[PDB]
Amino acid sequence: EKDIIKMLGLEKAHTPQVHKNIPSVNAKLKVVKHLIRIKPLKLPQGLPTEEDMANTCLKSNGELVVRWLLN
Amino acid sequence: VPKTSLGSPPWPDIVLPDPVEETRHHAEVVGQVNELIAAGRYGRLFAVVHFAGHQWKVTAEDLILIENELDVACGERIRLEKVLLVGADNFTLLGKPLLGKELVRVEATVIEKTESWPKINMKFQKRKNYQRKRITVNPQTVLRINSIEIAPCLC
Amino acid sequence: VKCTRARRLKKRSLRTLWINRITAASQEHGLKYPAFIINLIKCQVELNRKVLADLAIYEPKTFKSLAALAKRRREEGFAAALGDGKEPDGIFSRVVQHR
Amino acid sequence: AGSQWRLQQGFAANPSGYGPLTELPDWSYADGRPAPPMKG
Amino acid sequence: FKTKGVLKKRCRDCYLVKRRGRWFIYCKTNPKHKQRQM
Amino acid sequence: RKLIAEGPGETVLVAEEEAARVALRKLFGFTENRRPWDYSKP
Amino acid sequence: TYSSLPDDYNCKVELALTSDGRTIVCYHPSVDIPYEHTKPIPXXXXXXXXXXXXXXXXXXXXXXXXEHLEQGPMIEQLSKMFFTTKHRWYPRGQYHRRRRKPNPPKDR
Amino acid sequence: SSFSKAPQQWATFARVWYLLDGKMQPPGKLAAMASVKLQGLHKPVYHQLSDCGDHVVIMNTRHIAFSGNKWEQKVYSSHTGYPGGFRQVTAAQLHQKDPVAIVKLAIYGMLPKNLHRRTMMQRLHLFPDEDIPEDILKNLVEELPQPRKVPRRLDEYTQEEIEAFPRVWSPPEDYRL
Amino acid sequence: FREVVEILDGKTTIIEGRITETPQESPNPPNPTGQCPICRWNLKHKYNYEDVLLLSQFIRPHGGMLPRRITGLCQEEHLKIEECVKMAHRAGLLPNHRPKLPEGFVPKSKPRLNRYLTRWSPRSVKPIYNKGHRWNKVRMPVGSPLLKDNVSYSGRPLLLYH
Amino acid sequence: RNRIPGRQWIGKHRRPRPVSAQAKQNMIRRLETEAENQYWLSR
Ligand SMILES: [Mg+2]
Ligand SMILES: [Mg+2]
Ligand SMILES: [Mg+2]
Ligand SMILES: [Mg+2]
Ligand SMILES: [Zn+2]
Ligand SMILES: [Zn+2]
User: Fold this and answer.
1) What is the fold, at CATH topology level, of the domain defined by H1-177?
2) Contact at 8 Å (CB) between I35 and I74?
3) Would you call H166 an interface residue with chain B, using a CB distance cutoff of 8 Å?
4) Residue ranges per domain, chain C?
5) Residue list, annotated binding site of I for Zn(2+)
6) What is the DSSP string of G18-29?
7) Cα separation of I44 and C82, whole Å?
8) What's the number of domains chain I is made of?
9) How far apart are alpha carbons H107 and H118 in whole angstroms?
10) Do the Cβ atoms of G20 and B99 come within 8 Å?
11) Are F33 and C58 within 8 A, CB to CB?
12) Is C99 on the interface with D (CB under 8 A)?
């Protein structure tokens, strides 16, 4: 279990991390599912372009925001 | 449903005025206050200020000791920005969860860059033969709050 | 050693002292602690417990206003959940966003 | 406490995380010169 | 008397009565049927 | 019947004394609540 | 005409909310104490220490009071006065008196 | 707000004399608040190493109410220290002998266990009925709210409220009562 | 409510029935369709031992219970009412309904201890000398579990043991 | 005067300690989170 979690980069608690929703990974997640909290990412403004890289924030509802704090 | 000790919920019932009446009453109260501010009839302000990871209760002429180093030449005059609360004898202004910069301003001065006195951090084990002694010194910075200034504008 | 473990304890101690103070003044207004704190939060007012307790000692006025606020919001919450409809937002029940 | 309600509104669990509280540069020079940025 | 975990009416005239937070079996016809729940 | 000022004390005497201190302070304008002093460069 | 708490005491209290909505405000004037709720100042002064015959003898009669008790009994009365136990009222030892901070710090 | 220093501080830490009526109240729910007020935990200035604790006078002590059968099964024990000198006493008996005891033990057992308990035990005044030295009457500041709402017997209710409450069932006339 | 009357006259004895007026059930029940006298008045899981105005409606002048078949209560509410009646009594409420005995008011005993929410009889209970530590406790019973279905405004289930 | 034989939590005889309403809550809370988890892991 420990090493699943190690190779998930889930080392440090209460920290979000991102992963492919493919099955290869779901093997692992299925092994540890009681140790974790999974929630779907959501992209309301859509995906970050390069200009939006320094402005991108992640809200606890599981949502990504591209433009953070205009002027 | 007669009156039984249960059938009646044991707590005073609630009435909140209609939102239009309250909207009027509010605009009113705010205005009155804004007139106290336009007048400058407030004697002495305090403000609850978020700074450097902490919250402090600040009034003019005073002193706080910040636990970390800030890079400013000694003596520089500095506008603290994040302000949670403001207050005066008659009345009080509350940020959700902050005040508009234009609504208030607080200018403080850095007084003394310094190093903290030695603190002693000692870990120890029973008969495992492990002592570790460390002496730590922390850079510290003392600011004097100079002025709390409140501008007229509120709606 | 005891000095160090104490250094870590000291912060607990302070927080408890604080909380009890807050509690006390809250009581003076006929309001228990937890109700006060949460219903103060729900108004988007982040205040430390430190600064809270000092608002209860050195600022009885300001403080009484705070407890009134939270009281207002609480009853507004009782009516919010008892009303069972989406239309009313209490004037203080509204959730502002940053600009 | 109060993590729950904070969550349902969509704020951070902790008032320290990602709120405008932490984000803004809490001091300036009085002249208006924008302060040197913060390590956090 | 007797003290018992289990009462039973040992006859027709036996009856069942709760006194002093206990169960009793009292019998007029025979004294010997007297029982006391423990 | 208006209340001008009030004060605390160890005896009724010293109380009158201090409520008087207060009254005097509000009269003259020397009061904690007073605007803290100006420092500015005109 | 609504406040959550009675205006009986401290301040009359006005909560309001800015039409913007990003600011709460409070108007709290002090509520002073009603002349109805007051009772007259106690005035008691009576001098019978004056003997009609000689008044220097009589004005030396208010300086004529003083007394001596034992440690135990005095301590009892002392502790019945200020509502403390008999313990506070015993001396402290040499070592303990030695170490009381000679020049203690002062705020304000 | 503006006070001189000596008076200001004297005001902040000023002791208070509180009164609390015990007629028909659980000794527990009484001692709860009694203890609060004794430790000084109602005062926001409170601190442990600070002497603050407020006097408390409870009156009508004999008139305690005990929920459940507690009168019967709560026993108070103590020991002389002599062999076979051990004493178990029904609450009912104890209170019979000394009205004050019951409440005093509640409050005592309810404080922190350090020394100051002994001292705050001093500021606690306990009266079987309402008989109070006009000394202690004179200095009373304020009255505390009765911690339980006492149920009225049948005979308290106004006929207005007796009639106001609806007859639930209609009895048969033939039946005798 | 039929009073039975007896007359002793000149070595002859008259025993006869006489009917008094039975008050009638109030006009308008909230759940007219409802069955049991409690349940049509919306009173279920509401009345406690603290309601006299409800309770005194079923009992006898000398304080005992009514027969259920006469009151016709759902067996459950019958037992509930029973317990609450005993409780209210022990609670020294309904002082009216104690049986009248001209000699017995005179012989003072210590003023009756004020108690409430008392499930047992005061004579039966044995004093528990042994308490017991935190892992085996002897719980002093309060209220009756029959009432465990009364609605809790607190959401905290009523505490039956301490 | 009521004692526990041997060691508190260890042997064939143990200090009895009961489940708390609190405990019921915590457990349900975790179960909730994991029901949601094994949902998001489905598709
Ligand atoms: Mg790690
Ligand atoms: Mg740390
Ligand atoms: Mg052992
Ligand atoms: Mg074992
Ligand atoms: Zn038999
Ligand atoms: Zn029914």
Assistant:
1) Ribosomal Protein L13p; Chain: A; (3.90.1180)
2) yes
3) yes
4) 1-99
5) 36, 39, 74, 77
6) -SSSSEEEEE--
7) 22
8) 1
9) 11
10) no
11) no
12) no
